């Protein structure tokens, strides 16, 4: 199976209430493993997954050191952007940064990314060739020039294709039981009379991992996309995920509907029918 490691950084200014809030979290596929919170008491990078706890003090001291360097950078960033767009110093603003690498089934480098956003809009992003940038704004072009002159892209490329992939592999290895496992969804259907001539059919998919899944309804084998209530895949809170799809059925027509479930952990795609 394919895998990825991704880091998320959020920086939020608080005019008059002290320093900006800085939060960082790390993920491997859909499992979070570390975090840093500027408002927290420890002031350190912390474990959020059992398999990373076995890393020694050098790991934590190092990660703690670099993560707080990140924090300061985004603290300068907030001021710079304010200037770039001539904004008042009283308004709260947001900066987000995300980066990581994707690896194929052979655990080989597939793709790398490094994106940045100001107040929720794309600002600048490294293109897939890891040699060029996408600047949306005039402000973003100014940043692109700084980054080209400082050869940021080249440093990023070494990181994304080298150490990023390398530590992902190590993590996949060290956390095999949790990161390399595939929990197929436990599925089932519910039927509920909505009125005298209509009924709701809900198809459930529970405790599956990873989160990726395709849940669908058909009437006489034809897709019912527009007449299906499909909720967003959600965390169960124990490392697994859940999701459901529902359609309102005219009483007496239950048999012509089929629910289709596709997931990495299912040997064959499932086809369910109320009957």
């Amino acid at each position: 199976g394919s895998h990825s490691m991704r880091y998320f950084f959020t920086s939020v200014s608080r005019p008059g209430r002290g320093e900006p809030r800085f939060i960082a979290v790390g993920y491997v596929d859909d499992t979070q493993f570390v975090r840093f919170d500027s408002d927290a008491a420890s002031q350190r990078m912390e474990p959020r997954a059992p398999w990373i706890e076995q890393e020694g003090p050098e790991y934590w001291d190092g990660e703690t050191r670099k993560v707080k360097a990140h924090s300061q950078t985004h603290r300068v960033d907030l001021g710079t952007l304010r200037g770039y767009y001539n904004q008042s110093e009283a308004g709260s603003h947001t900066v987000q940064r995300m980066y990581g690498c994707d690896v194929g089934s052979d655990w080989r480098f597939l793709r790398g990314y490094h994106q940045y956003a100001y107040d929720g809009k794309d600002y600048i992003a490294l293109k897939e060739d890891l040699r060029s940038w996408t600047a949306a704004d005039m402000a973003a072009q100014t940043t692109k020039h700084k980054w080209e002159a400082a050869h940021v892209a080249e440093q990023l490329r070494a990181y994304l294709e080298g150490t990023c992939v390398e530590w992902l592999r190590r993590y996949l290895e060290n956390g095999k039981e949790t990161l390399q496992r595939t929990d197929a969804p436990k599925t089932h259907m519910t039927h509920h009379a909505v009125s005298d001539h209509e009924a709701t059919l809900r198809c459930w998919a529970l405790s599956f991992y990873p989160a990726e899944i395709t849940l669908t309804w058909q009437r006489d084998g034809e897709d019912q996309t527009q007449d299906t209530e499909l909720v967003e895949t959600r965390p169960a809170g124990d490392g697994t995920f859940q999701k459901w799809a529902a359609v309102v059925v005219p009483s007496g027509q239950e048999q012509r509907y089929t629910c289709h479930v596709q997931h990495e952990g299912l040997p064959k795609p499932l086809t369910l029918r109320w009957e």
């Binding site: 880091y7 790390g26 990078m45 790991y59 670099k66 993560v67 990140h70 990023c164 530590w167």
Partner: peptide
């Protein structure tokens, strides 16, 4: 692990 690069805007 986290990247050591971090270019200022």
């Amino acid at each position: 692990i986290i990247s050591a690069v971090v270019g200022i805007l």
